[PDB]
Design a protein around this ligand. Sequence first.
Ligand SMILES: [Zn+2]
Lengths: 104, 84, 204, 103, 32
Amino acid sequence: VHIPKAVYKAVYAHLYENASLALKEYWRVGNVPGITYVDENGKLCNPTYLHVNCIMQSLESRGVVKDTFAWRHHYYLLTEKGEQFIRKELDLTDDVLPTPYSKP
Amino acid sequence: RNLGSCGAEDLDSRVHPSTIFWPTEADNASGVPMRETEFCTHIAHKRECRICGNYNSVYRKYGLFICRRCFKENAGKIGFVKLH
Amino acid sequence: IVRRDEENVYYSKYLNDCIMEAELHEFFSRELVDAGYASCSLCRTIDSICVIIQCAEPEVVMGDNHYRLHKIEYLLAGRFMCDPKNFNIWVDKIIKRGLSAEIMVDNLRAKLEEAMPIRRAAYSIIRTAMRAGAAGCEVIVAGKLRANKFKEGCLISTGHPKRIFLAEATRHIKMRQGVIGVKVRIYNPNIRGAVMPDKIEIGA
Amino acid sequence: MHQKYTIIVVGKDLKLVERYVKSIVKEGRAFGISGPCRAPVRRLTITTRKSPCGEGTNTWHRFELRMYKRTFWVTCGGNDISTILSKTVVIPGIQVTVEVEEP
Amino acid sequence: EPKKVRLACLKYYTIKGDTAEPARHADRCHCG
RNA sequence: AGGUCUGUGAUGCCCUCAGACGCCCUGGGCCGCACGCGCGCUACACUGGCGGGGCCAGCCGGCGCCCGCGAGGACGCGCGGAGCCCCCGCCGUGGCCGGGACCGCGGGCUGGAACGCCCCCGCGCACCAGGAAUGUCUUGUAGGCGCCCGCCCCCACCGCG
RNA sequence: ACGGAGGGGUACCACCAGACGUGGAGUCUGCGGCUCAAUCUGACCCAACGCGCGCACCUCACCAGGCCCGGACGCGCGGAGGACCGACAGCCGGGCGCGCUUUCGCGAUCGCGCGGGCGGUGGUGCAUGGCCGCUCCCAGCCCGUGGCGCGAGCCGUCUGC
Ligand SMILES: [Zn+2]
């Protein structure tokens, strides 16, 4: 529950840069191979599944992103309200835009 | 309890550090090390249909890992065809 | 003479990509329904996969300069752990919409959920198909309303020719009282210029 | 230059997998590409009860998936990596007909 | 279910801002 | 109103929701047995049992050296297939060398953990062709003989072939 | 629809002629009954009983006991003068800062109530979808025009070979 702020910021940044979080349905012990964070650890340390799952649940419940589930993989996608909120937490300016708009 | 232990004579009986032979199946979760002490300390394979989270009646042949019941629905797309 | 565990990689490499796809079909069906998705494919490229799709309304799938398609593009990459950019989806279009079962069943489902009853929707669908050059259709609606069927002309329902000529689809509708099982089948005996057996002609 | 390269074709459908080789051999008309070895079919098999609950007369589905494959290791170093790309482009684009080149 | 006490300005182990310190047996922050 | 809400992000309505029917951990149980029967396996022997030897299959398929009676074990590399059957001898109608259930020491394997599985010495239950009743089968078929896959940490009298 | 009514046909899931069997023993397994804290449940003529794809832990619902909130999102009150959360040492506890006994650490990731969730191998298969089983190892089923009947219906769709 006591989720570090570094994880919050890392997830926000990864989301905005990719506009897409492709997450696995899990609820046991294990870290995520994708998003990453560093807290004076010497080597970027990956987050734990419980932490990111709770964060994703809160975000979606707040109406920032929508999701499909498919089978065995939560696919998320941020809305306009998403771009309008992450930029604030990352402390960004309206000029910046997600990468995918730049010819993937 | 980080500043305690047993007799040295008993320590000789410690289990061989040789890694355990009972792993967990991952179809494709980074292997990383309060309730955390024993949330799921017990270690065992959890092979399950990669469609439905059901651990019963799963084919491991050819590395499918598909429930027998959920096999019929998607077999047509997967390529398997019913002839002969 | 030969070793049987070398070719096993090639055999197992082709099978994995088959499943890698079906998930795509499921996901598109759960997402790009708005554009009436029909089917997909795959083509393992040097550094990516050249997935192309077929949707009746191409415009809906893509966005401003394909923006939302680009959005989707990155998503898949992380899920399959492939390099982005290299991903290169393609978008296609279906011409004879009255000859495909899935688009018709999806439109019919939506219509049914528009408060309009089964009869009008089924007759609209069958008219749309027949006016699109089809020997016949068949609409079945089952749920809390039994089975009320509707049919126009001749269909085959047995034999090898069924799997290639007859095309069927099914859906499920979550209505307040329960579930409305609906399916559709269309028999086109002129698909891809294939001659149905026991169909003969003699000249002068 | 010369690489002792190999060509492998793997697929499920007998129709395309047999038509595609004809185009390949056309393209190798002058580079000496020759007959392909046709491996025994890898007929994968699976059986399953038709009833989700196991009621009534015990019946069984029998699905199988074949894996035809052909090999054109003929080129070897007979061709250069320059036109090995040319070998891989003039060929038709079939949606699913996996292929791989090794020396 | 251990309890807590309202915090007081006891950390001043001095008599005129002399910073004396930065309890039964010894102990350090965290477990080490 | 045949079966399936206990296959599923298939689901309406009910019941449970901070002493939990949620998720997790340590143990036990699903195998427990006076008895009734349903699909099977092993036999009741000379058209046979034991020992030595010769030898050929297909779905398909991995092997060398050294310890150990055997099961198994330490190393190193890519290489490879059986029962019936035929031949020579012993046994000689004796519940006997047919039969291998049950039980006592012991040696090993899997696994965190044997209640699981193999091999060796010893003991050697019923069974003498089975009533009323009843099932299946027309050519490479019945019957007999063995060999691979499935679920599987170990194990096949089962099922698909 | 039925007939211990007639006439045509037909089938080793029927018979003629034969073959191989089961029911008699030992044993593997499932099904009822008894027992226990639990011995988790579905199915019972064809059309339930090696079937719901191998049960030491998980599988697993069942029994004896124990961790955690992993209570989203809104509204009202409080909170860094400190919301919530971890811990060396000693006892009781199968063990765990599980509980207690002193005292250190962490810092808003929130706490209480009201609305409102997610979850659940929990119930109704007599509320349903989907998939199978059976009728069915069948040879049968209907449309447009026309005609016959007030009409339900009949001819088309055959008392011939
Ligand atoms: Zn499944």
